[PDB]
From a paper:
Crystals of holo SepSecS diffracted to 2.25 Å, whereas the native and SeMet binary complex crystals diffracted to 2.32 and 2.07 Å resolution, respectively. Our 2.25-Å resolution structure of holo SepSecS possessed a phosphate ion bound to the P-loop in a distinct binding pocket as previously observed. In holo SepSecS, all four monomers are equivalent, possessing disordered catalytic P-loops and C-termini. Moreover, in the absence of tRNASec or large anions, the predominant conformation of P-loop residues (Ala103-Lys107) clashes with the placement of tRNASec in the catalytic protomer. Thus, positioning of tRNASec into the active site requires organization of the P-loop. Structural superimposition of SepSecS tetramers derived from our structures yielded RMSD values within ∼0.4 Å, establishing that human SepSecS adopted the same quaternary structure in all crystal forms.
Numbering used by the authors: 8 to 464
Amino acid sequence: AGERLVSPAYVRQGCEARRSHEHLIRLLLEKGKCPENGWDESTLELFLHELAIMDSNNFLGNCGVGEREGRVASALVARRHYRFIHGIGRSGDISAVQPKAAGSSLLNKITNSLVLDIIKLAGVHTVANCFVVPMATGMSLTLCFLTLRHKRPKAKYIIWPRIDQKSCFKSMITAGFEPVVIENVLEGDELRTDLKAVEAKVQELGPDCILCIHSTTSCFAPRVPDRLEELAVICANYDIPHIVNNAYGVQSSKCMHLIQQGARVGRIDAFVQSLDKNFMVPVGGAIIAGFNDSFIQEISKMYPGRASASPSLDVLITLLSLGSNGYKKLLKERKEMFSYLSNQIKKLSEAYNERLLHTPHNPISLAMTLKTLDEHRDKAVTQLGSMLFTRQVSGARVVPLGSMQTVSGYTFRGFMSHTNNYPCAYLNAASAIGMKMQDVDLFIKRLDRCLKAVRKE
Ligand SMILES: *Cc1c(COP(=O)(O)O)cnc(C)c1O
């Protein structure tokens, strides 16, 4: 409005240009959905700075005489968080609007609305409610289990189809329940759910003694996502809650449609996803989503005290920068890289007298056999994982046979294989969101060089 110096025509075009940024911000505040095209950084930072001004710690004429005033010692800390200091929620409700932080409260509502829009876009079009929690997937599963205790005070067991992952297994024990490990059935090369053993354990222990059935979608090959439809029917019949571990299944349309079809024909009370694995942000946050708004609110109000806004801000920045088209592009390129990674493993397996485990139901992880490797006591399988780690290859885990691990008092036989005696040792490789073609070409090149070193030795 300073037309005293600059000509009025040029100030009018600049002030009218600001209306274009306010148009994008208004559309987000009204519809609460992910924009199709990503915002420019100029629009995003203008939006973030305007939100932070609404927080009482950033008021020009504010005075504080309490114990939690959002004071910041280091200017580096304040700037790297865009001056969002008060966090999210209140002492009694993590979903409540914080009176001292209107901008942080609005940031939390918009983030959960953007996340809900992505969950529908990813495949679960029928999701009712969700919320971001600044805890990992393991601790977020624990929060679901802690909520179910007060609704099922006579239950002490959690029925859990086996998956060799320490975080989700410890969630059941951290919540104070006893996991009932259901071994998997070897159908071809795939380890799938044993529906007969699951329903048998329900009748042996009694439905009232079961806290919930804890299934899992995204997992390492040769394990595949659980039969969520049949497990949801069992949960609906015996009136047992169903909690789905969907750690990195948002990036997979097959995983999300499983959760959708399971809630369509049966019962799914909540499914939990990781922020870092599905949205390419730092580790630390998760999403608790469900189809019963009454129950999702119960989980949210079960959280004691305020919580960090840092994961919510990272997801807000990322989704607004990518847009719904930007996220869709990454979902399409992940399917392309999955086919490319599969074909490169097939070609490399033939040259070394190996094969690719046929796991068509796992759309993220692959497994190449390592049968023609260890000379019983040559330690070649263990050496391969160390040589790959030496040549700066991460994410390719090696699963040997006969491994035994004790996790929180429970001893697993055949650890990392999801079963007691898998036929052979294998090598894992996955196509996750954001993987470039250079990752596969460097992986194949360095894996080939590592295999030559063992064959030559
Ligand atoms: C990511 C992961 C988890 C939990 O990871 P956190 O360390 O809690 O963030 C649980 N189950 C599976 C299959 C996972 O991949």
